Structures are given as structure tokens and as C-alpha cells.
Design a protein around this nucleic acid. Structure first.
Ligand code: MG
Ligand code: MG
Ligand code: MG
Ligand code: MG
Ligand code: MG
Ligand code: MG
Ligand code: MG
Ligand code: ZN
Lengths: 37, 177, 174
RNA sequence: UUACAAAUAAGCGCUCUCAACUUAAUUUAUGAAUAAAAUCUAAAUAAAAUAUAUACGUACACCCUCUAACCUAGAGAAGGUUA
RNA sequence: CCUCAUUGGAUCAGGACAUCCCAAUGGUGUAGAAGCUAUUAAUGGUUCGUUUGCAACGAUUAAAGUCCUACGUGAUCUG
């Protein structure tokens, strides 16, 4: 989880969610792909 | 008319006992009503020097309602006066600790910022639930309309009313529902 | 009533005799204090409602004293209860099952070896004291040019707030 | 132990120190929008999870005679004691 | 053609969090152990000396944080 200003998907498996007031890209295959706004 | 000087003066400047019900009412619309009665601003004989305020009794203060997310966003801040003595507590947390606090603070801010405000607060009586002392009941003279119209829940809607409202659309039979 | 979990029973008022050494079967030495239960009676009972707490209250009293330099009020309180006046009253929080009738004496056997206890009493008075002995402030050097400042408080506070915070530690009665 | 070549005071001596209702990052379970045998939910929900804190405790609680004396109480006053 | 002039310490510290240690976590080119990076959190703590006039070292520590308060603080003291 890196807190970045812009959230961008990095692979096909990456998906987006809106949890606890923020946007997350969560990837099960590659956990490196996780970003928080 | 035709009253003696003494009873006439007593009748005019007598103080009245009122009842508010806070069930599902926003605290700040209750304060507007309560603050007006407390100052005596509802009387044509009102004067700032006349001590013409009235008693206001509010019940069900535990069941007040906040619009929006004010329960979590509105914060009450206090200081004991000692280093490290600053506390900020949200509306929800303050409500849990003290059921009557939020309404009392809302009314307090509305009153004039002068010495008489503290006397007015003595006239205010807040009970978290409908329970009232026996003596307080006898004093009450008049009830007051609630400021906010309380929307009905689905269960409250009558069977006839549901029929009266039209079915805008019909589900297809090929649906699990 | 029988004991149920969460119960709190009465306590005693005792006089402090002194200290003495004590040993365990392991050879360790433990300094111990001697407390004497002396004319301890239950004096007054309140119910949960009047005390305003969740729990009820029992007032106990020990160390009977003379009757000759006491206010009429205190003497009447004891005459109703049929006891000689006591030196001190204290309040104990007791659950309903553990209530004891007023006028009931209490004895050291109320406690048994192996239980842990809490004692509260007024500390020895030290009179008006300085800041070194009251709060353990370091103070200032003896020599090397220190002029009339050895045991004094240093700077009270900062220059900005232009006042002294409430609760600042200062010389006072200790 | 060091003093007063006093009945005391000190530390270099001795004893005692605890509960968390209430959250954030984060992690789960159930499940719609969204045909999933999806989805932790600024959807309705169920849980776990720092530091904080006072909801919850302990302490205090008495309306109090005073010539005077005495006091491990004290600058004074206050306070304690008086077959 | 040349140039150049408030701040240490002692005492007592209040506060910020842009966290030095303590605590809860995500990721890893994380086997374990050591580490690296980021989120969260201001909780209590954050040593003693030597040469020094600014640094330069010694021995420790879970750590020896970074800053604001008119060198924070001279009707408290001191170079
Ligand atoms: Mg010294
Ligand atoms: Mg001197
Ligand atoms: Mg000021
Ligand atoms: Mg500080
Ligand atoms: Mg932070
Ligand atoms: Mg000054
Ligand atoms: Mg002076
Ligand atoms: Zn990915």
C-alpha cells in the first residue's frame, strides 16, 4: 500500500474498490500493485 | 380588564411552563424554539430588563436526530486549563456519555452572551426519556409543535395506503427475487 | 445473604502501632506494619439510591474518644446509636448482600492471612516546604558564581504565554 | 547509614504501583448495485485490530465544642487530642 | 581596486509531528536471522565524559528524534 495522488491500474488482474472513504487498486496475483489514494 | 393593580401585574408577567418532545428532532431546531421561549421573546411585553422568560421542558432528548454525518463530523472541544488538558470528542461520543448534553449545548449557544443567559438555563429542564417528575407535570401548561415533520417508516404505512400508491413497474415472472 | 461474584464487603478502621521484621520459610526478611483494630463498629447504612452510586455505603468508626470537647451534634449521633463517640468516621462501598446492621462490632479476624488489602491514611505533614524537597527539583550549583540562587525554582514558564499555567509546581504546604 | 555528641529528620535504607466502554493504518466473514460458485461495505451488515481516554473505579464525604494545655497539625489562622 | 559583523550553559520546561526508541500494520529481489520501503500513532522516554571553541572523539543505550516558544526562560543564576 503506497499512498499516491493518482491511482492507476498496472495489470489485467488489478481491480478497484472504494473502502473506508478512499480508492484502492487491489491485485491478488501481484500484491506490489496495491495503491491507496 | 377590571382586575386590581396587583393581580393584573401578576397575570401579565407570570412565567409559563412549556413542553417540547425531541423525538427524531434536530437539536438545533429545538434550540431555536427553546431559546425563544427562554428569553421571553414570544411575549409582546418583552423587554431586556424585565426578566420575563419562561420555563421550557424538553423530553426524549436521547432520541434526537442529526442530518448528514454530523454525528461523526461535529466535535465538541473543552479545556480543563492544565497542560495536556485539551479534549475533542465527537457528537456520537458525547451523546453516549451524556444523553442530555447535545441539546443543552445547542440551546446555550443561542442565548445572548450576557450574565442573564445563566439564569435562563436554570429555567430549562431536559430529560433523556419521557419520564418526568410528578411535580414538573403539574406545572406544564401547553405543549409545542415539533419543528421537523417525522417521516413514516414502511411498517407505519397502512395497507390501504400501499394499495393507493401505484405500481410504477412490474417485475418479470422470470426473476428470482 | 450468601456470597455471589462481584460482591464488596465492609472494611475496618485501625490504629498504626509500628513496624517490625518478619521472615518467610525461604529466609527472606519482610518489613511489616502492625495495625490494631480498635473499637471498630458499623455506624450508618445508606441504600444505593440515597448514596447516588450504583453501590451502597456503610460508615464505620474506630478508636473511641472522650466526650468532653465534642460538639453536641456528634454526641447526639452516637447517643441514638448507643455507642461512645469514635475518633473518626469513614465510608465503605458495600454491595447489598454484604450489608451489616448498624452497631455491629468488627474485629481483626475479619481479615485472614494471604489476602491482599488496601490502606488509606493521611500522610505525615512536612509543613510549608521548598521546591527541592516538595517535588525533587535539582536546584542550582553551590559555587562558581551562583548569586542567592541555590534551592530556588528556575524559570516558571515561557515568555509567550505571558502567564503561569494552572497546576505549576511551586513552594507550598507538603 | 549520616547527623542532632536528644525522644527526630534524611538517603546511601524499605515498601507499593491496575482497569479501557469508546479507533487508524490494516485484515477477515456475509452480500447488492453488477447473470459471479464475484466484491471487507463514503451499500444495508458482522468481527478482529496501536497510542490515546475516564465511560467505570479508588480517595474525599461528618457542619462541626473550645478558657486553656498538649500535638507525629502548623509561618499566622486552620486541624487533632482532653479517665 | 578591497571589504565584513547575538549566542552557550544551569534550572523548569509548554507545544507541533514532518516518529529517534517503545506499540499496530502493507510491500519486498521478506526461507530463518538481520534489513529496506510505506501507512498509522505524539504515548512516555530520549545517557555520561574528553579535547574543545565550533566541532573533534571515547564508552554506552530500546533510543541518544527534528523543530516552535523574542539564546522559550538574565526583576531565577551564569560564561
Ligand atoms: Mg545540588
Ligand atoms: Mg549562596
Ligand atoms: Mg495570555
Ligand atoms: Mg515537554
Ligand atoms: Mg504521523
Ligand atoms: Mg525576565
Ligand atoms: Mg524578588
Ligand atoms: Zn496487479
Amino acid at each position: 500500500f503506497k499512498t499516491k495522488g493518482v491511482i492507476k491500474k498496472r495489470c489485467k488482474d488489478c481491480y478497484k474498490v472504494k473502502r473506508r472513504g478512499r480508492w484502492f487498486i487491489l491485485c491478488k496475483t501481484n500484491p506490489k500493485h496495491k495503491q491507496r489514494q | 380588564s377590571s382586575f386590581s393593580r396587583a393581580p393584573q401585574q401578576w397575570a401579565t408577567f407570570a412565567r409559563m411552563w412549556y413542553l417540547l418532545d425531541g423525538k427524531m428532532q434536530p437539536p438545533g431546531k429545538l434550540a431555536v424554539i427553546a431559546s425563544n421561549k427562554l428569553q421571553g421573546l414570544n411575549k409582546p411585553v418583552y423587554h431586556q430588563l424585565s426578566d420575563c422568560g419562561d420555563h421550557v421542558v424538553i423530553i426524549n432528548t436521547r432520541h434526537i436526530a442529526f442530518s448528514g454525518n454530523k454525528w461523526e463530523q461535529k466535535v465538541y472541544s473543552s479545556h480543563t486549563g492544565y497542560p495536556g488538558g485539551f479534549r475533542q470528542v465527537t457528537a456520537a461520543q458525547l451523546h453516549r456519555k451524556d444523553p442530555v448534553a447535545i441539546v443543552k449545548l445547542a440551546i446555550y449557544g443561542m442565548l445572548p452572551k450576557n450574565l442573564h443567559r445563566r439564569t435562563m438555563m436554570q429555567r430549562l429542564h431536559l430529560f433523556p426519556d419521557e419520564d418526568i417528575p410528578e411535580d414538573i407535570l403539574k406545572n406544564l401548561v401547553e405543549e409545542l409543535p415539533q419543528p421537523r415533520r417525522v417521516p413514516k417508516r414502511l411498517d407505519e404505512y397502512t395497507q390501504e395506503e400501499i394499495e393507493a400508491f401505484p405500481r410504477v413497474w412490474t417485475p418479470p415472472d422470470d426473476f428470482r427475487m | 445473604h450468601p456470597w455471589e461474584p462481584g460482591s464488596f464487603r465492609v472494611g475496618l478502621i485501625a490504629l498504626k502501632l509500628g513496624m517490625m521484621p518478619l521472615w518467610t520459610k525461604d529466609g527472606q526478611k519482610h518489613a511489616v506494619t502492625l495495625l490494631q483494630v480498635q473499637d471498630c463498629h458499623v455506624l450508618k447504612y445508606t441504600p444505593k439510591e440515597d448514596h447516588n452510586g450504583k453501590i451502597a455505603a456503610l460508615t464505620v468508626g474506630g478508636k473511641t474518644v472522650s466526650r468532653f470537647y465534642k460538639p453536641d451534634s456528634r454526641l447526639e449521633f452516637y447517643r441514638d446509636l448507643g455507642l461512645p463517640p469514635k475518633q473518626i468516621h469513614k465510608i465503605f462501598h458495600v454491595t447489598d448482600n454484604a450489608v451489616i446492621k448498624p452497631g455491629t462490632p468488627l474485629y481483626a479476624a475479619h481479615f485472614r492471612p494471604g489476602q491482599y488489602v488496601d490502606v488509606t491514611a493521611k500522610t505525615i505533614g512536612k509543613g510549608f516546604q521548598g521546591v527541592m524537597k516538595r517535588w525533587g527539583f535539582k536546584g542550582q550549583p553551590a559555587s562558581h558564581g551562583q548569586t542567592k540562587t541555590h534551592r530556588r525554582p528556575g524559570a516558571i514558564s515561557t515568555g509567550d504565554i505571558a502567564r503561569v499555567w494552572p497546576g505549576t509546581k511551586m513552594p507550598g504546604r507538603m
